[PDB]
């Protein structure tokens, strides 16, 4: 008799629960996927802005981003989502790539 939209309830908003630093279970080494995504995001955002702390001068966003990662200057964080509780929580681990092991990206 009614429309489907009437009985539809939008998903309730969630809370971000951050696992404390001494309870983190995942690895302190970046995966090749995570390092690749970090460099790609940083390179596009340098194609937008251009401001960096990397002292040496390069003519490409990709070179700047790669050297920022290797020299531990990249201004990004990695969020690893562990679980979504059905009381409306999002339990995550935040990892700092400036303090992590970096894979071999020849």
């Amino acid at each position: 008799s009614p429309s489907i939209c009437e009985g539809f309830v939008q998903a309730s908003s969630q809370t971000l629960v951050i696992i404390p630093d001494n309870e983190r279970i995942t690895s302190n080494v970046l995966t090749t996927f995570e390092a690749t995504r970090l460099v790609a995001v940083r390179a596009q955002q340098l194609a937008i802005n251009g401001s960096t702390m990397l002292k040496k001068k390069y003519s490409s966003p990709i070179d700047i981003a790669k050297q920022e990662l290797f020299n531990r200057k990249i201004p990004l964080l990695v969020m690893r989502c562990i679980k979504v509780t059905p009381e409306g929580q999002k339990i995550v681990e935040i990892w700092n790539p400036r303090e992590m092991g970096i894979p071999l990206l020849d």
Binding site: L16, Q45, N49
Partner: protein, 339 residues
């Protein structure tokens, strides 16, 4: 009326590195640029009070733009009009055969389209300022617009009044809630007191249901009521005093209440009876005291706002004479003392 609201939204960030240099300031600026002065979720936003809750700046994931986004929960000052509300100023711009078009001045931006009837297209003309009476759930806040679309009718004070039956006491915490409305009446009173005597007197005599032989209606300091031949054997009861006493639990709120057209709509006075003796054309409504109190304070606030707004609109006598047609149009709907 003006109150608070809590909104949730997602903001696209086109330059995350710059945005994250000062998150709070940039966030407030962008919220103000998007939402100030517009309709959103059945309301109209006036100011951004503050940001209650926010998320980190996530990088967009489904495209290669490198752009950010943020979830924001912010508190805003909004102005939601009630059904059958009463506005004091409007300039009719468009006066055609189909519709009558105007805009409000002294409150928030609202556009009122009066259905053009055969008795109204001949009276209201462009340039005039009239009081308007709103209707039920007609104030639709279309999101993304700068005004509230609403239909209204020319305000002529009514000759009828409603009686509600109260059978339950007013408890202390409902009074604690109603303290805000009491305080709003108080600040309206202290604002009205600064205004000129002659303006408020002329407007009160105009918008009183009946007519009096001058200088017998108003006691701004004491609020003693109309000194008309002692029409009722019971003195009008001040609502504010009754609430202040029922704070300490000294009087009972049970029985029949009413506000007759002779009773001054602005003043906090009202009538209470243990029996139904009111000459009301409509059946009394059986209910609890909380709704009686909320409705009566809303009515008092609306009428104080209307009288303040009438005085604030017409700061000169020249404009009053320029709009006097509306004045005698109201005057001919007054009821004389032939009773």
């Amino acid at each position: 009326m003006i109150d608070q609201k809590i909104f949730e939204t997602t903001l696209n960030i086109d330059d995350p590195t710059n945005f994250c240099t000062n998150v709070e300031a940039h966030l407030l600026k962008e919220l103000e640029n998007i939402y100030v002065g517009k309709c959103f979720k059945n309301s109209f936003i006036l100011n951004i009070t503050g940001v209650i809750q926010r998320s980190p700046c996530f990088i967009m994931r489904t495209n290669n733009s490198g752009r950010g986004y943020m979830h924001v929960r912010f508190s805003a000052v909004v102005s939601y009009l009630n059904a059958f509300d009463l506005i004091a100023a409007v300039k009719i711009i468009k006066n055609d055969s189909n519709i009558i078009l105007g805009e409000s001045l002294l409150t928030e931006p609202v556009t009122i389209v009066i259905p053009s009837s055969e008795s109204q297209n001949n009276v209201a003309e462009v340039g005039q300022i009239v009081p308007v009476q709103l209707a039920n759930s007609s104030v639709y806040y279309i999101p993304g617009r700068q005004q509230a679309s609403a239909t209204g009718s020319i305000f002529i004070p009514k000759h009828t009044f409603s009686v509600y039956h109260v059978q339950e006491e007013l408890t202390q915490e409902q009074a604690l809630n109603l303290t805000k409305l009491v305080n709003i009446i108080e600040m309206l009173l202290e604002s009205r007191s600064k205004k000129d005597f002659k303006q408020i007197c002329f407007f009160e005599k105009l918008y009183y249901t009946y007519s009096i032989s001058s200088d017998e209606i108003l006691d701004l300091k004491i609020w003693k009521g109309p000194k008309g031949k002692e029409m009722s054997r019971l003195k009008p009861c001040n609502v504010l005093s009754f609430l202040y006493d029922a704070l300490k639990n000294k009087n009972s709120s049970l029985g029949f209440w009413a506000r007759p057209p002779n009773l001054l709509k602005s003043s906090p006075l009202a009538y209470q009876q243990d029996q139904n003796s009111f000459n009301a054309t409509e059946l009394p409504i059986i209910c609890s005291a909380e709704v009686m109190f909320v409705t009566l304070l809303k009515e008092i606030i609306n009428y104080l706002q209307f009288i303040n707004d009438l005085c604030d609109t017409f700061n000169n006598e020249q404009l009053i004479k320029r709009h006097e047609n509306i004045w005698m149009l109201i005057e001919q709907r007054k009821i004389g003392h032939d009773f």
